[PDB]
């Protein structure tokens, strides 16, 4: 059986050999990057079923992200399998400042009255916590009494009980025992801090990514369609119109504007890390199931992200809760599941990919029984979608090992994928931009082929490439879909059921 | 908008012209049969929607039947449209004898005690009714006390109160007021009277029919699968393997043996006349729905028969219950509705066909909302059946004016029909046996075409035959199914969605 | 066991003996009504399953209708069973006049040109048909060129091809061969002849009927809510607020206003006779199913009317199409089936009721498998309604022989009836108006009892009434519903499942 | 918003105070158990939503288990709220022995060849790992070449490559890098070590548990119905027939015998820790959903256990994974969710219970929209069950705040619970065994009350207990169910819908 749900793996030092040293040994950050040895490691993640690599520009400067992307291009040749290239923007960040006298952190206790300063370019004291806000924005006027300020992935919460106009300081009450360390992520849920739709840092990060060559951008903290439209404009300008934009939904505002965001984007990344701090943590599974249904209904890509195999960062086995989360994300109808720290900076990047692949492959076999998505409810809004519906029906009527589509732009493949047939989908395309562009769509196995000439038998070509890929053997039944004849046919218009000889 | 539900019309004097006179006109029986004028009159039934003519061998001799069949063959050429040919057998029958003294009938009152004689060759008296039993069988040992003897379309009931061994007479009580006339039909419900599986006279009737050229045999009072298999043996013996056998379910035994009768036959005629006398009348609607569903699930033809527009025998307008009966037969899922005395012996044969066609045409538009058949429940047991399922799916996703199948034996057109698509089925076939064999399948418009050569584009032929037939025009979307390419393809294996040029 | 679908039987001269004479005999109408022999005939229809008698004010004067009502009152005492009393208005009928020269009828041929007169109080000639318009209305201005005048149950069509202002005659073309006889019903479909919302003669007939004692009024040709509201005002102002109104839907305007008619009425009579003339005959089965669903969703009574066993007017047995019609009306979800000429004028009134009761009883056993009504879909809009839903659930979960409700006004009985439980409904009420008012609700067996004391065990009273009615025996499981306790309870608020001692 | 999903919290040192020190603090184990301060910690778990305490007989002697049970009996009096008492057996555990020279652990690399001894009562060396097998059983004959020995929650794999018959030692190959620490769990999947159906240690522990007073026994590693029936015999033999048995399904054999184990047991604990080691980890979510469905269909209790908020052992926040796992367990249909190490040995026992209670409470609001259980499919096999079905129908038809049942044994409450009504269930019972007996049934709020007299209004009692309990206010709608009248009723036979005054 082939794996239909796609894997995004984040790259970091965990895979990268430096002068024979594995990550986090004595001296490691001294030695020179070992490019062949690293690439051999990354080629193992590809063979274990990583379909796209995520380059997280929250961490590591341009040269490091340049070097990692080039190491991946090497690994593609060692594996003999191509992968997608996804850039993840930094976006708006609030961090806690340095402390007076280079103190790393302080410990607080429930009931404690302290203050949070809004003045920029100062240091924190134990008593007065200062913020490093992207663009040095003043946030005093943006947050009201009763709002919460949450420090370090939401581990410590401060309730704003009052506002001091003379100092521009929040009077806060500590809500639980915990630590405030320096240069730690701060969230302020249910506030509209006027960060730009697209910051200048993220503009430059994107333009460099587009230069090196990428297939996808995931845009952090998308709040309105404007955040997506402005990234789109740049993709257009530089002739990178092939690039697909996933909005990262991370906060209440993003969730409020989700319908317009989906309309503007090619896909949604469900960024549960932030979203779980920014909205009631118990609501995240509600939003997860709703988002997946709405994006699938739009024929777009949905990625479920963050903590999927979290304990595998430090321990060799996933917990029962983590296997359950990966399985249920498949059953909910996700196109893709993602690894962050587990692949980027953990002790078990390869085992983490193998584990997610094993769960994902198992879960796809339960989609008939338990799948939340319902393709019978969709309006078939074009003739290609009608063909996709009929392909679904054939794969429901009898045992179809494979669907094969000859697809110029990938449109047929995306509509077949949308209907979630009980078969793998071989997308035969004629250019690498379409090929890589398809690597996160559920079920789709993109494969490069010569454009069929008017004398070619498209059906013989489809059967032959399917046998070449080892996907089917003698006696297997396959469905082939194509625009027949080539030149005359305006769209996919023909379906054949073919016994493989 | 074409009529999907097929009409069977029974031929008789009502459509024959004698010396420029219609049936019922003064002098009619004193004029000679006008063959051409009759053929032109029958041509009007073809144009109005008759798809098959029934030749009832219960009435008239071989000479009369043979000449009716020859006159329909003329009518086909005048209308420019072919129809099926159906022989309906005499089968097991009991009639009241002639009365001593050339008396016509007597009248009887409830509770009156009389006798029914079983001795063959005798005349009836007022107090002693003699039976003409088919093949002069002695029925005395096969009817128990408490059984009922019903005379003339079930109008008069006689309870068997005792058996007189010396006279071989039944002592009977008159259960209701009514008349006994000579040569009227007698039923004895829930007896196993040992009429042969195939009587000699039905053997000879079927041979005569097979010599004339027929597409269908309706076997009267099928009691077991043996009744069907013995007719099949003659069809096989004579090289008439193409002839489809419809079992007429008319009594309790046929209903007990329904599953084995359906397996052995090509279809069922729901013969409601005898059925509603031979089982409790109020159960006939139950048996009708059940049979339609079982036959449809087997991919076979079901004909709903008898009294559907009964009043139009004598009146120009159908009753409200008659329009309701024809409508509800369509919703039940009937392939065909039948006219008996309405077309054969009535004053308004053309109006009867037209009325039936108008009802059938309107009821077909309500099969989506009210239809009792459920194609989603069927096992697709072959590749031609999964193609039929996918055509049904395409006709549910978008407006398809027509499904075109190129079919060698009609097998693809039978399976498309079974799934009751939201479109007309144009069955392009290569011989006239196949063509006329399809004329009672729901939705199917059979049409003769030259066998395509491996040079011929079947999708162009399909489109051109449909434009030439008047069925589609520019802008209409059609589904085309075929075994591509001719030579290699072992079955129907391809579907195209095509906008007609 | 008990017949849940109600029968309305039309009373006419078929059951009425007058000075030893029967309908058709010379001097019949001059002889005095033999009230006792007539009541014994009617008592037989009551025993055979008639639940309500219809008095058709289209035929016979006030005295005739008055004597016929008094004879049913006597028949109730002979049968020992009460029935409802339904008055059916004449309404805006048009009829062909008497001819000159005492002529009964004339023959006409397709293409013949004749005239229809609009002038009132004159006589038809062969060439000039005169119309007897209800209220002597002048229709000349309300029927345009291109309309159709239909004579005699829709049997002869006349196309208005011109209008002569000098004589105020329609110039018509005979559309088909047939007969214009005297006093035959005329319809002019798709016209708004401005007959008043309530004519003086219908006003007078209703008032006469209210004075005699009636439960129901069926209002002929309801076009708007106004037609119902005008009869409502009269029932209310005379102290007859208990009288229930059934709108007869007989024409296109009635169908166009169906939803506000149902709101304003207590029920609908599906008057198929005129409806099948006034709209395309093939649409009637469509409107019947839709009407029955809508009326049942409002908790109101639907009567399926006209031609149900038509041929039993003249012949001893129903056709197979007639049995199918009554069976399919039950499965559609009708509360009540109706007889007109079959019971009012025919040769076989007792046998027609018996036949209809046998069909209804059988058909009820198939409502769980085939029944078109879906109670699971309704909004439960009150707590009496949620209790009726819970009763329906108990009768679905186990074998419940009987549902008993103690109901002051019949509201709880109506709502249980709406949900169509798999059980008979014993409605114990405390006055005869309510008791007779429940006689047409599906499943309801109404029965008189004293208003229970706040002393009384209502669940014991219910069991005892059920044993006294012969409905249950020792071992049977019954559902009892009541407002507990009396005085404190504002509504039905209790359900008990009890095993009969 | 009452929490309908029940919480099982495992007791351990995490909640125990010893001379003013919390668990983990310097010198903790030196100080003595402070019973009052421990009981006050435990009362806070009770207030936050813990419904039953698990006493895990895998860890601590009888003296420690007994003290802990007495402390919870104090906590119930401080909380003002009763809780269930669940004993969890040791069962057939294997552990790594102590090392020679008191060495704590050793590290191994992939491909190392070592030995595992079967000899009982000796210490391990690096090269020869010794096993503490439950009951000192010799496992040498039970594990074949090619089997896997896994150490410490499945973290390190040892493949058996050969067996030395002389020393009765396994030759094993290290399959992955990791640690063998002393006294860690060992698993040998897909073997059948002949552990007795009931080991003497588990017999003794259960008998100690029954003498102290328990409501529930969770039987570890149930392989067959016989493992349950042996504990059942002890419960009955000792007067403890009320005690409920949960089979823990933890290996392949229990899964293979699931249907038989469910028949013999009162419920299932889905013991995902051992299950995910003993069967393919990716299959665990499959078995979970299936178990929940079958157990619910049986009207029994299902507890979903292990790793549910794992990270909250060491960190203040749950991962997105863990929230997703608890939420999906609720949607699957679990009666109860469990905390093990998170409540027994973690830093945040209270915040763990609080967190789970928040997820569980939010998830129940979505069971209507997303719930996998379907009560419509159940056969109602008894009159109580039909009453449960009607209750469910009323809670779906309108807004019912509370279902009240007066239940002597808890049968009516268990069946109402089984049907998952959209309301809390107040179970008023008359003894403490039934009260505590019901604390793991979904939705059930057990409450001790006086047995109603012959004179009492049970519907007044129901309303009044519900108001006193703070569960309903004026104008709320409730559903009350009872066997009325008291002393006459043989079962629940009455449902009332009452507005709180
Ligand atoms: O797919 P199925 O049901 O096995 O049927 C395949 C058979 O039908 C046929 O295709 C006949 O089909 P048509 O008569 O429709 O052309 C045969 O060639 C073949 O043997
Ligand atoms: O529950 P609903 O639909 O509000 O109806 C309540 C009304 O029904 C009644 O209970 C009448 O019911 P019955 O006639 O069935 O006893 C009135 O007392 C009350 O006003
Ligand atoms: K015949
Ligand atoms: K009338
Ligand atoms: Mg017959
Ligand atoms: Mg365990």
Numbering used by the authors:
A (entry chain C), B (entry chain D), C (entry chain A), D (entry chain B): 1 to 501
Reproduce text from the manuscript describing this model:
This residue is Glu93 in SpPYK, and we found that both Mg2+ and K+ are necessary for the proper function of SpPYK. These results demonstrate that FBP is the primary allosteric activator of SpPYK.
The bound PEP or oxalate is seen in the catalytic site located at the pocket flanked by A and B domains, and FBP is found at the effector binding site in the C domain located ∼35 Å away from the catalytic site. This interface rearrangement is accompanied by the formation of new side-chain interactions including hydrogen bonds between Ser389 and Asp393. In SpPYK, the C1 phosphate is located at the effector site pocket and forms hydrogen bonds with semi-conserved threonine residues (Thr407, Thr409, and Thr412) located in the short loop region preceding the Cα2 helix.
